Amino acid sequence: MNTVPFTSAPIEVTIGIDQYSFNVKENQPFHGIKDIPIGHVHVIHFQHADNSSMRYGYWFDCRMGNFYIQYDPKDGLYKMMEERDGAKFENIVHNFKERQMMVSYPKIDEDDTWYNLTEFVQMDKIRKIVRKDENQFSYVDSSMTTVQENELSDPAHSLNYTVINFKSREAIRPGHEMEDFLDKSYYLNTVMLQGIFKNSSNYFGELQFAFLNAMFFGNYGSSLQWHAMIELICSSATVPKHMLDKLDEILYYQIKTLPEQYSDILLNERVWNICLYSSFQKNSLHNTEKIMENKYPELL
Amino acid sequence: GAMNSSNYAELFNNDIKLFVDDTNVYRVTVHKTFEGNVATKAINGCIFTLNPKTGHLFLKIIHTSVWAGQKRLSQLAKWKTAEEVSALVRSLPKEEQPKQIIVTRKAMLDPLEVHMLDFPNIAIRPTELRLPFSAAMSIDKLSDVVMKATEPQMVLFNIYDDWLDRISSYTAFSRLTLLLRALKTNEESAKMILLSDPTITIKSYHLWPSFTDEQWITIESQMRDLILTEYGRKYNV
Numbered sequence: 001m002n003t004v005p006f007t008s009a010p011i012e013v014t015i016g017i018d019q020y021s022f023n024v025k026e027n028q029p030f031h032g033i034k035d036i037p038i039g040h041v042h043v044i045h046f047q048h049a050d051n052s053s054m055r056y057g058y059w060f061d062c063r064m065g066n067f068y069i070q071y072d073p074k075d076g077l078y079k080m081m082e083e084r085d086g087a088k089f090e091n092i093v094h095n096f097k098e099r100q101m102m103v104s105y106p107k108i109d110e111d112d113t114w115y116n117l118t119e120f121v122q123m124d125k126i127r128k129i130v131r132k133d134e135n136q137f138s139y140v141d142s143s144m145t146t147v148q149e150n151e152l153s154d155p156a157h158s159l160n161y162t163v164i165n166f167k168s169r170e171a172i173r174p175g176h177e178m179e180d181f182l183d184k185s186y187y188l189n190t191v192m193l194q195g196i197f198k199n200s201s202n203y204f205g206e207l208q209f210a211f212l213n214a215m216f217f218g219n220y221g222s223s224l225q226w227h228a229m230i231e232l233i234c235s236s237a238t239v240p241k242h243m244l245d246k247l248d249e250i251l252y253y254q255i256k257t258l259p260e261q262y263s264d265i266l267l268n269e270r271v272w273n274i275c276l277y278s279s280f281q282k283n284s285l286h287n288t289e290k291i292m293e294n295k296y297p298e299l300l
Numbered sequence: 301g302a303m304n305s306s307n308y309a310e311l312f313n314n315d316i317k318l319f320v321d322d323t324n325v326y327r328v329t330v331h332k333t334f335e336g337n338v339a340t341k342a343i344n345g346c347i348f349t350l351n352p353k354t355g356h357l358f359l360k361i362i363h364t365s366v367w368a369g370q371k372r373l374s375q376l377a378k379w380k381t382a383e384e385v386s387a388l389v390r391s392l393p394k395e396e397q398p399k400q401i402i403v404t405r406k407a408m409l410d411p412l413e414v415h416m417l418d419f420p421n422i423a424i425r426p427t428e429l430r431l432p433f434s435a436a437m438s439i440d441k442l443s444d445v446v447m448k449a450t451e452p453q454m455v456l457f458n459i460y461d462d463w464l465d466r467i468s469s470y471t472a473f474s475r476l477t478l479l480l481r482a483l484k485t486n487e488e489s490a491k492m493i494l495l496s497d498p499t500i501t502i503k504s505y506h507l508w509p510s511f512t513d514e515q516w517i518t519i520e521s522q523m524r525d526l527i528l529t530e531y532g533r534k535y536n537v
């Protein structure tokens with residue numbers, strides 16, 4: 001079990017750690033989060049009490065180094081940094097754990113939610129979507145746009161998700177125009193899976209990371225990306241059976257975890273009705289259709 | 301974007317454009333089978349592609365053989381249309397290719413857009429106008445060449461005959477759409493209006509009668525009377 005210590009909490013802020021969150025008051029004696037499960041990526045995020053504008057946060061994996069948070073009063077945000085002196089880190093963390101100044105990552109033992117939301121998400125791949133190579137962690141916020149969004153404006157601060165466009169030369173073989181637009185199997189299997197992602201585990205990882213950025217930061221382009229990657233599978237007549245079963249499980253936990261009050265903005269009516277009721281895979285997502293109909297029947 | 305009453309004169313500027321109408325591509329007769337079930341029999345069709353500025357009509361005839369062994373023919377008809385429009389543009393020299401293609405039905409937008417991905421600078425637009433191009437098969441010489449075809453075939457016409465020698469393209473298009481609107485609302489009356497007498501003949505190289513200016517005014521008035529009438533007959537007013 002690992003720890004993200006905090007130099008201090010100088011501004012009132014709601015801190016999130018994965019799907020958990022807690023309020024910290026202005027200059028409260030808060031010095032970080034302990035008992036973080038090793039083996040998963042994590043995200044630590046922030047919403048200032050004063051400015052609900054700009055949720056932001058940091059994807060990280062505690063196996064890749066000792067990370068702490070320090071408020072920067074110039075830039076005005078809580079910043080993730082790496083302590084490279086490992087003894088200074090153990091000493092500082094032990095000092096605070098003894099003074100009981102840390103919140104414990106509150107995982108219930110029965111609870112596999114975070115695992116199920118991040119099964120295929122890997123840090124190395126997150127770092128390629130969020131390009132900032134001097135750091136082992138990755139910053140994301142509400143306002144960041146995607147590579148595809150910048151094509152339709154600062155390239156350093158973008159989300160480089162894989163570009164998916166159903167009306168593109170990449171998606172449509174000359175002479176198979178009708179075939180490939182109504183059945184996207186060519187584009188999913190040859191172009192994306194075989195060509196770009198190499199395997200379905202990388203495809204799923206990008207889709208899970210897209211969803212998590214949409215949910216935690218209200219990042220619009222991430223939501224677009226999530227929906228697109230679902231639609232591409234649902235609109236392929238030919239999808240490996242293991243991918244369909246795995247997708248059903250993925251979506252199921254995403255829909256389970258989504259805040260009930262955010263469904264109106266995070267869920268695309270058209271994509272979901274199409275996927276569940278019209279597409280080739282309308283009968284292949286039993287768990288996802290069942291929770292969608294029982295929780296968000298309004299959308300359908 | 302879409303084309304409507306407000307941007308109507310754009311049709312007659314100097315940017316090459318084509319209307320495409322697919323309403324006569326997939327045509328059937330519905331009949332009873334010996335077992336008392338219903339079956340369709342396809343008949344020849346056509347794509348109505350029209351330059352509204354010059355009157356050039358590229359009438360791509362759709363032979364029934366193209367439906368043989370195919371499923372979901374109404375969907376396929378839309379993609380066949382787009383495939384034939386795309387082949388048409390590629391056959392034209394660059395300076396003759398349209399800068400816009402306007403589709404008369406919105407269901408053609410995706411099939412055409414996908415078939416024209418090679419032409420990013422050709423704008424595919426819908427329209428809000430209720431244009432009467434479906435009535436093109438009420439034009440005898442067009443009906444005739446579609447029904448007589450024994451293979452796929454493209455035939456080129458000028459649907460304005462020689463009108464542009466005397467009137468503008470805006471007026472020629474107004475005449476054309478009044479005539480077609482009439483033919484669609486009451487084909488028999490419309491056809492009676494045009495040719496019951498023979499001292500105003502259709503030249504061998506034309507589609508419509510050789511009316512004088514003064515006869516076109518009378519004709520045009522008779523078609524409006526017809527259209528307003530059928531519209532009362534239809535709503536009783």
Ligand SMILES: O=C(Cn1cccn1)Nc1ccc(Cl)c(Cl)c1
Pocket residue numbers: 005006007067068069083088089092093
């Ligand atoms: O890094 C600093 C300040 N600093 C060290 C060297 C130069 N400046 N403080 C610090 C270090 C590590 C951790 Cl884990 C925490 Cl919570 C606080």
